[PDB]
From a paper:
SPACA6 is a sperm-expressed surface protein that is critical for gamete fusion during mammalian sexual reproduction. This structure is reminiscent of IZUMO1, another gamete fusion-associated protein, making SPACA6 and IZUMO1 founding members of a superfamily of fertilization-associated proteins, herein dubbed the IST superfamily. The IST superfamily is defined structurally by its distorted four-helix bundle and a pair of disulfide-bonded CXXC motifs.
We expressed the extracellular domain of human SPACA6 (residues 27–246) in Drosophila S2 cells and purified the protein using nickel-affinity, cation-exchange, and size-exclusion chromatographies. The SPACA6 ectodomain was crystallized using a random matrix microseeding approach, yielding a 2.2-Å resolution dataset. The structure was determined using a combination of fragment-based molecular replacement and SAD phasing data from bromide soaks, with the final refined model consisting of residues 27–246. The 4HB domain of SPACA6 includes four main helices (Helices 1–4) arranged in a coiled-coil fashion that alternate between antiparallel and parallel interactions. The core accommodates a disulfide bond between Cys41 and Cys55, which pinches Helices 1 and 2 together at the top, accentuating the triangular shape. Two additional disulfide bonds are formed between the CXXC motif of Helix 1’ and another CXXC motif found at the tip of a β-hairpin in the hinge region. A network of covalent and electrostatic contacts in the hinge region appear to stabilize the orientation between the 4HB and Ig-like domains.
Residue numbers in the entry: 27 to 246
Write the structure that this text describes.
């Protein structure tokens, strides 16, 4: 995480304060620094903690500066700060676990220090079809509910219908169902012409987080 939360100029300035502006050791110093953090090069942290960690690294830089200004060897200074940061990292709050089988799960997002970028679970947007069997004249209810946490802001539910009795996730068979809004869709009453797949797209603003599918089997 050293490379992600400190810049090359900061690290060069630290090493110069250690050995000198244009010292021949100035190169070795560099490789003592980065190597000292080699173990933390592939850690994954809770995305929501990145700022915190970055701030901590800022503190670290200053702590090193003073250490260099007061003589002090870089050879011991860098492993020391590396272990301090290792403990800081171990005490950070964890992101939520990935929950199968589908969805963009923002509360599971993690920051990868190897590459310095964020990542959610590699799950499909489309969730498995849920079979819902009712009889003619009976009420049917589709709950657009996922098993992972959704953001609070800007969530909408868009419904679609693929008729003709198709059990399908293929979008080319669906038309929009503008009557339906919200997480709960009701067919009152269900009839044979409702046979088909109902889909609900959960969106944050305009980006989809999940697409659910309900195959309504209406029985005579
Ligand atoms: Br940050
Ligand atoms: Br020292
Ligand atoms: Br985590
Ligand atoms: Br939120
Ligand atoms: Br909505
Ligand atoms: Br089918
Ligand atoms: Br449409
Ligand atoms: Br409609
Ligand atoms: Br409702
Ligand atoms: Br979509």
């Amino acid at each position: 995480c050293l490379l992600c939360f400190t810049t090359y100029s900061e690290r060069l300035r630290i090493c110069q304060m250690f050995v000198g502006m244009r010292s021949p050791k100035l190169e070795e110093c560099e490789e003592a620094f980065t190597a000292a953090f080699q173990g933390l090069s592939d850690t994954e942290i809770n995305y929501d903690e990145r700022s915190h960690l970055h701030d901590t690294f800022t503190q670290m830089t200053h702590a090193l500066q003073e250490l260099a200004a007061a003589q002090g060897s870089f050879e011991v200074a860098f492993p020391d700060a590396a272990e301090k940061m290792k403990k800081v990292i171990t005490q950070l709050k964890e992101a939520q676990a990935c929950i199968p089988p589908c969805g963009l799960q923002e509360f599971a997002r993690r920051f990868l220090c190897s590459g310095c970028y964020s990542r959610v679970c590699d799950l499909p947007l489309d969730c498995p079809v849920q079979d819902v069997t009712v009889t003619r004249g009976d009420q049917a209810m589709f709950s657009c509910i996922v098993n992972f946490q959704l953001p609070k802001e800007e969530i909408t539910y868009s419904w679609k219908f693929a008729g003709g009795g198709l059990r399908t996730q293929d979008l080319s068979y669906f038309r929009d169902m503008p009557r339906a809004e919200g997480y709960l869709a009701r067919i009152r009453p269900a009839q044979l012409t409702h046979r088909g797949t109902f889909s609900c797209v959960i969106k944050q603003d305009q980006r989809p987080l999940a697409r659910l599918y309900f195959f309504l089997n209406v029985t005579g």
